[PDB]
Amino acid sequence: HTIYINNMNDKIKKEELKRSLYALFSQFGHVVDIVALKTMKMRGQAFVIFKELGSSTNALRQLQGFPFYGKPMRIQYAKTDSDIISKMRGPDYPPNYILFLNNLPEETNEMMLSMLFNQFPGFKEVRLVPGRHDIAFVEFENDGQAGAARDALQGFKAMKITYAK
Amino acid sequence: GKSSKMLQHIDYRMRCILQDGRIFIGTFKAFDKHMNLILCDCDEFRKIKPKNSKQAEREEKRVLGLVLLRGENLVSMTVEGPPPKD
Amino acid sequence: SLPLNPKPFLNGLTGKPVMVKLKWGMEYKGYLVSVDGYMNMQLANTEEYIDGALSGHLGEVLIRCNNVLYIRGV
Amino acid sequence: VKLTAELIEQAAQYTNAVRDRELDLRGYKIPVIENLGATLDQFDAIDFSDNEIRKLDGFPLLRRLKTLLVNNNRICRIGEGLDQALPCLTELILTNNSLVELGDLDPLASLKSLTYLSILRNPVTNKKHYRLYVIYKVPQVRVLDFQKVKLKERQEAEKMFK
Amino acid sequence: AHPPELKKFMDKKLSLKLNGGRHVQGILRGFDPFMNLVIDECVEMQNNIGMVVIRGNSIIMLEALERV
Amino acid sequence: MKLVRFLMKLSHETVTIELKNGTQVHGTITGVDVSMNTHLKAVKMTLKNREPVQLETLSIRGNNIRYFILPDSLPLDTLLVD
Amino acid sequence: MVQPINLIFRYLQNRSRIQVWLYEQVNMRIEGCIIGFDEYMNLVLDDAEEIHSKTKSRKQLGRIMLKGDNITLLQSVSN
Amino acid sequence: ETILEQQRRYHEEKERLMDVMAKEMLTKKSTLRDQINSDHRTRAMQDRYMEVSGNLRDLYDDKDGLRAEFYNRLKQIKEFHRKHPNEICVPMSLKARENPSEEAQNLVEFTDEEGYGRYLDLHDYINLKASEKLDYITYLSIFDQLFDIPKERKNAEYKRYLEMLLEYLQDYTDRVKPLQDQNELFFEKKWENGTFPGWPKETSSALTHAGAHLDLSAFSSWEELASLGLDRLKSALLALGGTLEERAQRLFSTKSLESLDTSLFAKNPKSKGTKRDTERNKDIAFLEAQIYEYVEILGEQRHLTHENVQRKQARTGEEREEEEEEQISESESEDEENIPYWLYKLHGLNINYNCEICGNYTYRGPKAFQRHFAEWRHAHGMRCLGIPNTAHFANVTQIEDAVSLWAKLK
Amino acid sequence: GVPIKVLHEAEGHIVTCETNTGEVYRGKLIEAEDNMNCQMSNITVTYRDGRVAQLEQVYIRGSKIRFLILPDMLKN
Amino acid sequence: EEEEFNTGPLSVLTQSVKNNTQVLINCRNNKKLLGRVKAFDRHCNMVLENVKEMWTEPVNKDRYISKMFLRGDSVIVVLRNPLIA
RNA sequence: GGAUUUUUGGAGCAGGGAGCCACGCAUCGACCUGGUAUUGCAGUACCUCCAGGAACGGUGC
Ligand SMILES: [Zn+2]
Incomplete structure (x- = not known):
C-alpha cells in the first residue's frame, strides 16, 4: 500500500524531502500521507503511503533508482503496514511469494514473465510455457520483492493472479 | 431601567473600536450582558476613523463579513451608519 | 509540613513586615494591617522599592490584589 | 468533463502530504482550465493531475495558492498571466506531460516564488542544455527535476542563453 | 464552572502557546474548569521541564500534532 | 457601597471619560448600566495624537474606561446617597 | 485523570521544589517549596526565589504567597 | 498549436454569442427596448428604437411576452458581452496536422464538443426549462447585488442615508420625509445652499458613502449599459466644465466662494486660496458630483423610492406589513415563473403494527401486518433486502433477516 | 446570550477565529462553546508576520x- | 461588604471617606491621582472630589478634576497618609 | 456578581541617528557554501559531525 523509497541523501530536510517524495509520486497519482523521519535510525529513508496499493506499485516501478536530491532512490513495496493506509482501508500466508494461476492472455511468455519478475529483486523461478499458454507460476525468494511485483502486475488484463497459499 | 443603550445599536451599523486600535463597523444584530456585538458584513479599519479623507479615503479596510467581536476586547463605540435595508 | 493556605499565610504575616510586589516591578514593604477575602493587602508605613533600590515611604498603602503580583514576608 | 464551481465545491478539501489545504480536481480530463475563483483561496494546493488541459491558462485570482500539480497531462503550453495569477505558486509538477517547446517553459520564468520543478519524462527536459536553460531562465527555482542548483550550476548556466 | 473540551487532545501530543512568547508541547493528561492543563513530560520551547501544569489565564491556543 | 449607582444616576449630565487606552470623550451621558456601560449623547471623542471626531452617540464599557471626571455642577453628594 | 490542582497538592505534600513562569513576564519566574495552596490556585512558596530565564540568576525572596493570576505554567524542579 | 483554427473558432464563438443574444431578444425584446430607453437618457448620439414596438415588446412583427427577470437578463447579457469582447481581444493580437491525427486512432469515443459548447453555454445548468439565464450565469442572483428595499433596480434605500444624516446632525429632529426633500438638489444648489455644509466632517463622511452607494445602485441598474463609458463621459464633462454661472456672482468654486469675473476665477486657482481647497477637497467634490450625476441618472428611481417611503409612512400597520411582505416576495422570487368501536376492539385494530421491510410502513391490525409479506411495495422491500420472496423471508418482518438469505446456506 | 447561542x-x-495574540485560524470547526472557545480540524493558521501553516x-x-x-449565511 | 471594608484592606479608603482626607491612588496608566474620596466600594472604587492626577511621560504635570468618579479597575496602590492636614 | 474564557483590566514604559538605503543587546530556531557519515521500514516538538558566511527570522526592553 506504500512505496518505501531508500538510498537517498541525508542532507535534505524532513519537510523538503517529504515534498520532493510527494512531487515524485504525484505523477503516479495523489498521495495520502508522507512518512519522513530525519532521525539517525531512519536517516535518508522516506516514503509516501496512499490508500490504494496500485499507485504505490506504480510509484515503486517508476521512481526506483531515479535521480532524487542527488541520490538514486530505490523504491519497493512497504515491509510494514502504514498507519494511514491501514486507517484508510479500515490470511497469514497471503500474499505469498509465489503467484501461480491461469488465464495469462495477450502473449504472456516465459521471457515476458522473467522480465516482469526482474522488477522483483528476489525472484527465483518463472514457469510460463504451456501449450494453452494460460497457467503461469512466478516464485520469488523475497516477500517484499514479490509484493512489489504483484502490485506492478496487478491489472495486466482480466488476468488471474493467485498466490500459492 | 429601559436598558435601551445596547438595543439602540441592534441591527444598525455601529463602529466598535477595539482595544488593539482597530475599529470594526457593521450591522450589530445582537446585544448581550457582556456587550458582545456580532456585525454582519463588517469592515475593519485600523489606522483612523475615515471622515472625508482628501489624501486617501480607503486605507487598510478589510471585509470580515459576519464577524462577532466580543465586548471584552472593545475600547469604544461610535455611530458610523444607519441600518441596512438588506 | 502541615497544610497552610496562602490566605492563612497572609493572615499570619499580619503584624509583621511584608512586601507586596506589583506587576510593574515595584514593591511596597510595610506592616500589613489586615487581609481581605480576595487576598487584598494594605501595608501601613510601606516603603517603595523599585528596581532593587528603595524609593521612599508613602505611609499606609492599600495595594490591589490583582495589581500586586506577590506577597512575601521580610 | 469541464471544471465548474459545482465540481470545485464537490472536490475534496483536506490536508496534503506537507500539511496543506488542497483542492482535488484531478482526474477530470478538462480541455480548458477555469472556475478557480470559487475556492476563495481556501486551498494552498490545486491537484488537477492526469487531465486533458493543453494550455496552462485561465486560472483565477488566488492569493493563498502555493502548489499547482498538473502532472501526467497534455500541457503543451503555458499562459502569459502566470505571474499575474499565481505569484505565490512555489511548486508546479508537470511530470510526464506534453511539455516539448523551450518557449512553453518561458512563462514559468516569471513566477518569482517558484522553487520546485518536476518536469520528468517530458520532451522539454530532453532537449540540449535544457537544465542550463531552465536554471538561466529561473534563478529563483531551487529544485529542478528533483535536483538542487548550486552556485557552480548557476555559473555554468549563466553562459548559455544570456 | 464548566470544564474545557480537551477530551480529543487527552493522552495525545499537543503544543499550547503561553504568555511571554513561550510554548509547551507534551502529552495532556487532563484539564480543569478554569482551563488549567496538566502536560506530562512537557518541553518549554529547547529543553524539557517534565510534568507541568499551565493555568488557563495564559492558555491562548493549543494545536495537536497527533490523532485527536 | 458602589460607584455603579452613582454612574447610572448621572443621566443627562455633561462629564468627561478618559479611557484605559487614553481616549477622552467629553459629552452628556444619557444612561449607564450596572456594569458601567455608559451611553453618551453628542459626546466628542479624541484619541491619542489624533484629531477628534463628533458623533451623535458613544457607548463606553467599564473595563476599557480609566476615569470618569464628573462636572463641578454634578450632584455627587446626591448621587452617593442611596 | 490527574488534575493540575491535584498535582499541586501532591507537590505541596511532598514539599519539593516547583517553579512557575510569570504571566506576561518571560524574564523572571517564581520558584520555591510549596507548603499549601488556596481555592484560587494560589500556592504558598517556602524559601522562594526569582529564577531568571536570560540572566540565569536567583534572588532570595523567603516565604512568598503568590497569587494564582500571575502563574502561567508550573512544573517541578530537581534543585 | 493552430492559431488560424483558434481564430476561426473565436470568430464562430463571436457569431454564436451574437446569435444567442439575438434568440434572447426574439424571445423577449422588452429588455433591449428598456435598455435603449435607459441609454437614451445617458448618450444622445445613439438612435432610439420604436416607441410602439417597445411598448408592445416587439422587434419587427412578433410581440414578445413580459419578462428580477430583466435584471438577470441584463446581467447575463453583460457577462456575454464581456466574454465576447475578451474572445475578440484574444484573437485581435496542414500535412503535419493531418499526419498527427492518425496517432491513437483506435479510440472508441465521441468528439462533438468543438463549436456547440459556445452556443450551449450562452443560450438563454437547466435540464429543459428552469432558468432563463445561460450556463455561465446560472448561479447569478440579484440578492447579492441589491438590497431588499430596492427590489432588483426598482427603488433605492434612503433610510440608512437618513439615519446617517440624523447621526451627523446629532439630533432626533430629522424624519424620513425631510431627507428625500433635502437630497433632491443633488446644478449649483447643493454646493452653495444645500442642506448641510460643503466641508463638514460629520456630513461629508456620510455623503461620500451615499454617493458611492448611489453610483453602485446606478451601475446595478445600468449594468447592461456602458458603465465605463458613462463614467468616462461624466469625468470628461466635469473636466470640460465654469459650469456654475451667475448674472452678478459670476462663477463659484466647489472653497464655497464666488468670483467677481471670469478673469479672476481662472487666476484664483493659481493662488493660495482655491489650490488648498482643490488639494484637500478633490475627493469630496468628486463624490458630490458623482452623487448629483447618480441622482440625475436615477431620478425616476429616486422618485419611486420617495413614493414608496411616502406610501409606507402614510399606510397603516397592516398595510405596511403587507407592503413589506409583497416587497420580500418580489425580491426573493425566481426570474422566470413556472364506524363502530367493537370492530376496532375485537379485531386487533386497536393496536397498530409497523413493518420495517416495507419502508417501516404502519398498518392497523395484525392481519395487515402479516399480510405485508405478500404485497407489492413490500415485495420491493424484499427486493431491497436481496432475499428472494420465500417463506423464510416472509417469516421475518425486519431488515436484519436478509443475512439468512439464499446466499447464506446451500 | 444571542451571540453565545449563535x-x-x-x-x-468553514469559519475563522482571530486570537488576541494575532493568530487567525480558519477551518472547519468541530465544536464551539458559548465563551468563544472553538476546536477545529484541518485548518490553516496565519500568524502576525504573514506565515501560513496547516x-x-x-x-x-x-x-x-x-x-x-x-459565514454570511448565519447572519440572515 | 461593609464589615469587610471597615476592617480589611479597604479600611484606608473607608477612613479617608470618613475623615475627608486626601489619598494618592496610583492608576495603571502611569499616573497618580491625589485627592479625597467621597465614598468607597468593595472593589476599591471611589468617586474622588478635587482629584489632581499627576502623570509622568519623566515630566511632572497636573490635571485637576472637581469631581472624578474613578472606576475601581485602574486602582493599583492607594497610599493613604496625612495629605489633607 | 474586583479570583484565569468576557465589565472593576498583567498592564504601563522605551522606537531614533548617520550618509533614496543600512542599524543598540541577549536568547532560541529554520539556512547558504564544501568535506564527511548512515544503506537504515518510519508515523515524528527537533535530530550526523567539522569549517566559513549570515546584509536570516520571531519574542521582551
Ligand atoms: Zn411490511
Whole structure:
C-alpha cells in the first residue's frame, strides 16, 4: 500500500524531502500521507503511503533508482503496514511469494514473465510455457520483492493472479 | 431601567473600536450582558476613523463579513451608519 | 509540613513586615494591617522599592490584589 | 468533463502530504482550465493531475495558492498571466506531460516564488542544455527535476542563453 | 464552572502557546474548569521541564500534532 | 457601597471619560448600566495624537474606561446617597 | 485523570521544589517549596526565589504567597 | 498549436454569442427596448428604437411576452458581452496536422464538443426549462447585488442615508420625509445652499458613502449599459466644465466662494486660496458630483423610492406589513415563473403494527401486518433486502433477516 | 446570550477565529462553546508576520480569543 | 461588604471617606491621582472630589478634576497618609 | 456578581541617528557554501559531525 523509497541523501530536510517524495509520486497519482523521519535510525529513508496499493506499485516501478536530491532512490513495496493506509482501508500466508494461476492472455511468455519478475529483486523461478499458454507460476525468494511485483502486475488484463497459499 | 443603550445599536451599523486600535463597523444584530456585538458584513479599519479623507479615503479596510467581536476586547463605540435595508 | 493556605499565610504575616510586589516591578514593604477575602493587602508605613533600590515611604498603602503580583514576608 | 464551481465545491478539501489545504480536481480530463475563483483561496494546493488541459491558462485570482500539480497531462503550453495569477505558486509538477517547446517553459520564468520543478519524462527536459536553460531562465527555482542548483550550476548556466 | 473540551487532545501530543512568547508541547493528561492543563513530560520551547501544569489565564491556543 | 449607582444616576449630565487606552470623550451621558456601560449623547471623542471626531452617540464599557471626571455642577453628594 | 490542582497538592505534600513562569513576564519566574495552596490556585512558596530565564540568576525572596493570576505554567524542579 | 483554427473558432464563438443574444431578444425584446430607453437618457448620439414596438415588446412583427427577470437578463447579457469582447481581444493580437491525427486512432469515443459548447453555454445548468439565464450565469442572483428595499433596480434605500444624516446632525429632529426633500438638489444648489455644509466632517463622511452607494445602485441598474463609458463621459464633462454661472456672482468654486469675473476665477486657482481647497477637497467634490450625476441618472428611481417611503409612512400597520411582505416576495422570487368501536376492539385494530421491510410502513391490525409479506411495495422491500420472496423471508418482518438469505446456506 | 447561542451553531462550517495574540485560524470547526472557545480540524493558521501553516487539529480557548468570523449565511 | 471594608484592606479608603482626607491612588496608566474620596466600594472604587492626577511621560504635570468618579479597575496602590492636614 | 474564557483590566514604559538605503543587546530556531557519515521500514516538538558566511527570522526592553 506504500512505496518505501531508500538510498537517498541525508542532507535534505524532513519537510523538503517529504515534498520532493510527494512531487515524485504525484505523477503516479495523489498521495495520502508522507512518512519522513530525519532521525539517525531512519536517516535518508522516506516514503509516501496512499490508500490504494496500485499507485504505490506504480510509484515503486517508476521512481526506483531515479535521480532524487542527488541520490538514486530505490523504491519497493512497504515491509510494514502504514498507519494511514491501514486507517484508510479500515490470511497469514497471503500474499505469498509465489503467484501461480491461469488465464495469462495477450502473449504472456516465459521471457515476458522473467522480465516482469526482474522488477522483483528476489525472484527465483518463472514457469510460463504451456501449450494453452494460460497457467503461469512466478516464485520469488523475497516477500517484499514479490509484493512489489504483484502490485506492478496487478491489472495486466482480466488476468488471474493467485498466490500459492 | 429601559436598558435601551445596547438595543439602540441592534441591527444598525455601529463602529466598535477595539482595544488593539482597530475599529470594526457593521450591522450589530445582537446585544448581550457582556456587550458582545456580532456585525454582519463588517469592515475593519485600523489606522483612523475615515471622515472625508482628501489624501486617501480607503486605507487598510478589510471585509470580515459576519464577524462577532466580543465586548471584552472593545475600547469604544461610535455611530458610523444607519441600518441596512438588506 | 502541615497544610497552610496562602490566605492563612497572609493572615499570619499580619503584624509583621511584608512586601507586596506589583506587576510593574515595584514593591511596597510595610506592616500589613489586615487581609481581605480576595487576598487584598494594605501595608501601613510601606516603603517603595523599585528596581532593587528603595524609593521612599508613602505611609499606609492599600495595594490591589490583582495589581500586586506577590506577597512575601521580610 | 469541464471544471465548474459545482465540481470545485464537490472536490475534496483536506490536508496534503506537507500539511496543506488542497483542492482535488484531478482526474477530470478538462480541455480548458477555469472556475478557480470559487475556492476563495481556501486551498494552498490545486491537484488537477492526469487531465486533458493543453494550455496552462485561465486560472483565477488566488492569493493563498502555493502548489499547482498538473502532472501526467497534455500541457503543451503555458499562459502569459502566470505571474499575474499565481505569484505565490512555489511548486508546479508537470511530470510526464506534453511539455516539448523551450518557449512553453518561458512563462514559468516569471513566477518569482517558484522553487520546485518536476518536469520528468517530458520532451522539454530532453532537449540540449535544457537544465542550463531552465536554471538561466529561473534563478529563483531551487529544485529542478528533483535536483538542487548550486552556485557552480548557476555559473555554468549563466553562459548559455544570456 | 464548566470544564474545557480537551477530551480529543487527552493522552495525545499537543503544543499550547503561553504568555511571554513561550510554548509547551507534551502529552495532556487532563484539564480543569478554569482551563488549567496538566502536560506530562512537557518541553518549554529547547529543553524539557517534565510534568507541568499551565493555568488557563495564559492558555491562548493549543494545536495537536497527533490523532485527536 | 458602589460607584455603579452613582454612574447610572448621572443621566443627562455633561462629564468627561478618559479611557484605559487614553481616549477622552467629553459629552452628556444619557444612561449607564450596572456594569458601567455608559451611553453618551453628542459626546466628542479624541484619541491619542489624533484629531477628534463628533458623533451623535458613544457607548463606553467599564473595563476599557480609566476615569470618569464628573462636572463641578454634578450632584455627587446626591448621587452617593442611596 | 490527574488534575493540575491535584498535582499541586501532591507537590505541596511532598514539599519539593516547583517553579512557575510569570504571566506576561518571560524574564523572571517564581520558584520555591510549596507548603499549601488556596481555592484560587494560589500556592504558598517556602524559601522562594526569582529564577531568571536570560540572566540565569536567583534572588532570595523567603516565604512568598503568590497569587494564582500571575502563574502561567508550573512544573517541578530537581534543585 | 493552430492559431488560424483558434481564430476561426473565436470568430464562430463571436457569431454564436451574437446569435444567442439575438434568440434572447426574439424571445423577449422588452429588455433591449428598456435598455435603449435607459441609454437614451445617458448618450444622445445613439438612435432610439420604436416607441410602439417597445411598448408592445416587439422587434419587427412578433410581440414578445413580459419578462428580477430583466435584471438577470441584463446581467447575463453583460457577462456575454464581456466574454465576447475578451474572445475578440484574444484573437485581435496542414500535412503535419493531418499526419498527427492518425496517432491513437483506435479510440472508441465521441468528439462533438468543438463549436456547440459556445452556443450551449450562452443560450438563454437547466435540464429543459428552469432558468432563463445561460450556463455561465446560472448561479447569478440579484440578492447579492441589491438590497431588499430596492427590489432588483426598482427603488433605492434612503433610510440608512437618513439615519446617517440624523447621526451627523446629532439630533432626533430629522424624519424620513425631510431627507428625500433635502437630497433632491443633488446644478449649483447643493454646493452653495444645500442642506448641510460643503466641508463638514460629520456630513461629508456620510455623503461620500451615499454617493458611492448611489453610483453602485446606478451601475446595478445600468449594468447592461456602458458603465465605463458613462463614467468616462461624466469625468470628461466635469473636466470640460465654469459650469456654475451667475448674472452678478459670476462663477463659484466647489472653497464655497464666488468670483467677481471670469478673469479672476481662472487666476484664483493659481493662488493660495482655491489650490488648498482643490488639494484637500478633490475627493469630496468628486463624490458630490458623482452623487448629483447618480441622482440625475436615477431620478425616476429616486422618485419611486420617495413614493414608496411616502406610501409606507402614510399606510397603516397592516398595510405596511403587507407592503413589506409583497416587497420580500418580489425580491426573493425566481426570474422566470413556472364506524363502530367493537370492530376496532375485537379485531386487533386497536393496536397498530409497523413493518420495517416495507419502508417501516404502519398498518392497523395484525392481519395487515402479516399480510405485508405478500404485497407489492413490500415485495420491493424484499427486493431491497436481496432475499428472494420465500417463506423464510416472509417469516421475518425486519431488515436484519436478509443475512439468512439464499446466499447464506446451500 | 444571542451571540453565545449563535456561535454554537458555527460547527461543521468553514469559519475563522482571530486570537488576541494575532493568530487567525480558519477551518472547519468541530465544536464551539458559548465563551468563544472553538476546536477545529484541518485548518490553516496565519500568524502576525504573514506565515501560513496547516494544522490537523487546533483548539483556541476564549481566554485569548479576540473575535470569530463566521459565514454570511448565519447572519440572515 | 461593609464589615469587610471597615476592617480589611479597604479600611484606608473607608477612613479617608470618613475623615475627608486626601489619598494618592496610583492608576495603571502611569499616573497618580491625589485627592479625597467621597465614598468607597468593595472593589476599591471611589468617586474622588478635587482629584489632581499627576502623570509622568519623566515630566511632572497636573490635571485637576472637581469631581472624578474613578472606576475601581485602574486602582493599583492607594497610599493613604496625612495629605489633607 | 474586583479570583484565569468576557465589565472593576498583567498592564504601563522605551522606537531614533548617520550618509533614496543600512542599524543598540541577549536568547532560541529554520539556512547558504564544501568535506564527511548512515544503506537504515518510519508515523515524528527537533535530530550526523567539522569549517566559513549570515546584509536570516520571531519574542521582551
Ligand atoms: Zn411490511
